[PDB]
Structure 1
Amino acid sequence: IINGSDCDMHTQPWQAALLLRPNQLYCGAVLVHPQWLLTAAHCRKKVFRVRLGHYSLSPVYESGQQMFQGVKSIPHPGYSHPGHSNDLMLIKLNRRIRPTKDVRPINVSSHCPSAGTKCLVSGWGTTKSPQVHFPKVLQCLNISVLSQKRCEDAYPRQIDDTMFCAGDKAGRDSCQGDSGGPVVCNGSLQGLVSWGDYPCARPNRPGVYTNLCKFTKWIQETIQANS
């Protein structure tokens, strides 16, 4: 997250981090069900761990912490390179979460975001671009949803309704390391960090996020088919 601020503690209980030994965080994820996470399809990995209810980046022990193992990874069937449409994937935890003020799922909105909607995106990604610089703790940033028209103009021929743009204010954007992370609007999960221009936070170049309102039926049917 470029130009964000340390998140308040306990305000992102659905935020997750994906790690692959020792504790190298490669993507964020979002707890959307007592036993399911949602992350970007390009964040797929065979072996990895899931960390929930943990504020800092380093593996410093925290009381609210809860570690898990991903038993099943299911990317949306429409995901493809280099278009990157349908950039979402379901991950099943080995066991259900112990609900607490630290670890709590969030609902996925079925109503699509309209131009002007203020949303909050969080992550442990780099706070600088192109120079890499990781934060100490979870970063938060409010971004506003642009119109699908402007979105398409900014990235001609590389955008469809499976995504949406957000982040008008310059110097502020999501970046590498935030991928798979949540974009919350109106108390609901509206999107996942997917991609954007590079370097991050270039003026008039908004971040592109997975448009989750288009996948509620698939998400719920997939979870039920594996319960």
Structure 2
Amino acid sequence: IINGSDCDMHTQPWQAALLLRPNQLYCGAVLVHPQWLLTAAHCRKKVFRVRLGHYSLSPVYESGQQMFQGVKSIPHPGYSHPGHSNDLMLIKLNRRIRPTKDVRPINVSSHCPSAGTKCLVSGWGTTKSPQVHFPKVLQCLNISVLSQKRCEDAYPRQIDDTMFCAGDKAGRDSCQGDSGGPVVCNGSLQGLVSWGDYPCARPNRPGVYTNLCKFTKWIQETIQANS
């Protein structure tokens, strides 16, 4: 997260981290069900761990923290290795989470984001670009959703309906390491960190996020089919 601020503790109990042995923090994720997480399809990994209810980046032990393993990864069928469309995947945990103030799922909005909507994006991604600089704790940033029209101009022929652009303010944007992270608007999960221009935070170059409002049915059906 570039030019963001330290998140307030205990807020965002749905924020998840996808770790790789030993403790390589790759991609973020979001708890959307007692036993299901949501992340970008391009974050698919065969072996990995899931850390929830943890504020800092380092494996520093914390109370309220919970660890799990990915027992099943289901990327949306429409996700194409080259294109950024349908950039979402479902991850099932080995067990149901223990509901606490630090670990709590969030609902997926059925209504798509309209221009001007203010959203909150978070992640342990680099706070600088192109120079790498990881934060100490979860970073938070407010971003406003742009009109699909403007989204299309900034990224011609590559912007799609399964995605949306967010972030007008200068120097503020998501970056590498935040992928799969949550974009919350109106108290619900509206998107996921997907992609953007490089280096991050370039003026008139908003970040692109998966438009979750288009997959509510698939998400519910997939969860029910694997319950």
Residue identity (%)? 100
| Aligned equivalents of 1:96, 1:70: Cα separation in 2 | 12
| Aligned equivalents of 1:81, 1:18: Cα separation in 2 | 20
Flag as ranges the 4+ runs of structure 1 deviating above 4 A. Answer: none
- Give TM-score, length-normalised by structure 2: 1.00
- Per the alignment, residue 103 of structure 1 pairs with 103
| Aligned equivalents of 1:80, 1:155: Cα separation in 2 | 18
* Deviation digits for residues 130-178 of structure 1 (CA, Å, limit 9, x no counterpart): 0000000000000000000000000000011100000000100000000
TM-superposed deviation, 1:50: 0.1
- Per the alignment, residue 60 of structure 1 pairs with 60
- Per the alignment, residue 193 of structure 1 pairs with 193
| Aligned equivalents of 1:64, 1:103: Cα separation in 2 | 7
| Aligned equivalents of 2:63, 2:97: Cα separation in 1 | 15
* Deviation digits for residues 27-53 of structure 1 (CA, Å, limit 9, x no counterpart): 100000000000000000000000000
| Aligned equivalents of 1:128, 1:147: Cα separation in 2 | 27
| Aligned equivalents of 1:4, 1:221: Cα separation in 2 | 35
Q: What SS is found at the alignment partner of 1:160?
A: coil
- Give TM-score, length-normalised by structure 1: 1.00
| Aligned equivalents of 2:14, 2:98: Cα separation in 1 | 12
| Aligned equivalents of 1:147, 1:79: Cα separation in 2 | 23
| Aligned equivalents of 2:4, 2:65: Cα separation in 1 | 23
Unaligned runs of 5+ in 2: none
| Aligned equivalents of 2:30, 2:201: Cα separation in 1 | 23
| Aligned equivalents of 1:175, 1:16: Cα separation in 2 | 17
- Per the alignment, residue 78 of structure 2 pairs with 78
Matched, 1:161 2:161: yes
Q: How many residues align?
A: 227
| Aligned equivalents of 2:32, 2:81: Cα separation in 1 | 26
* Deviation digits for residues 157-213 of structure 1 (CA, Å, limit 9, x no counterpart): 001110000000010000000000000000000000000000000000000000000
| Aligned equivalents of 2:82, 2:223: Cα separation in 1 | 27
TM-superposed deviation, 1:82: 1.9
| Aligned equivalents of 1:75, 1:149: Cα separation in 2 | 28
* Deviation digits for residues 81-102 of structure 1 (CA, Å, limit 9, x no counterpart): 3211000000000000000000
- Per the alignment, residue 48 of structure 2 pairs with 48
Unaligned runs of 5+ in 1: none
| Aligned equivalents of 1:81, 1:45: Cα separation in 2 | 14
| Aligned equivalents of 1:6, 1:69: Cα separation in 2 | 27
| Aligned equivalents of 1:200, 1:29: Cα separation in 2 | 20
RMSD: 0.4
